[PDB]
Design a protein around this ligand. Structure first.
Ligand code: CA
Ligand code: ZN
Length: 182
């Protein structure tokens, strides 16, 4: 088994601009690539787990998401961050794209994406971390038995509910390796 950092994308890796689907609108938050290289170095698996309901909404396609995601993956790999998994949920109950219109158990706060990563990569759950900007990220993490639940301030101007469900509140993912060391 391996401990992991589970990662939100929007608001945690990239700046949340609303339905980010183009390379030209993807902007890594300051210090997050270096922080991830350090988290790799300290021996964590890194696993993205992202809700992408813009797909169900018909904002962008699965093909556009894969194009953006291949790019993000290479762009991290080239900076010596090698991601262990990238999981995403394209669904929404009210989606207008029929393929993707459904209730599912991968859509955060449902824990399914973290569970699939857990079985695939054989993850030590209680030794693991979930980093996100939203309450659903905290709720997915509790359901999944993630040892430590970290809310960041680089996405959703946080809510009192999100803050209640979290263990740590950090300014950003860029602050996580020092918070883990101490
Ligand atoms: Ca987010
Ligand atoms: Zn889903």
């Amino acid at each position: 088994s391996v401990p992991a950092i589970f990662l939100d994308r929007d608001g945690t890796i990239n700046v949340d601009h609303g339905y980010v689907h183009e390379i030209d609108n993807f902007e890594f938050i300051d210090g997050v690539i270096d922080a991830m290289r350090e988290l790799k170095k300290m021996g964590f698996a890194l696993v993205v787990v992202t809700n992408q309901s813009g797909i169900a909404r018909g904002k962008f396609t699965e093909a556009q998401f894969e194009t953006l995601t291949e790019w993000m993956d290479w762009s991290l790999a080239d900076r010596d961050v090698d991601l262990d998994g990238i999981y995403y949920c394209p669904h929404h109950p009210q989606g207008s794209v029929e393929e993707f219109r459904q209730v599912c158990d991968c859509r955060k706060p449902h824990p399914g994406m973290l569970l699939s990563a857990r079985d695939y990569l054989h993850i030590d759950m209680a030794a693991s971390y979930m980093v996100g900007d939203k309450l659903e990220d905290m709720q997915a993490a509790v359901a999944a038995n993630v040892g430590t639940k970290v809310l960041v301030r680089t996405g959703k101007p946080i809510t009192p509910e999100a803050e209640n469900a979290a263990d740590w509140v950090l300014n950003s993912l860029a602050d996580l390796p020092q918070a883990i060391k101490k």
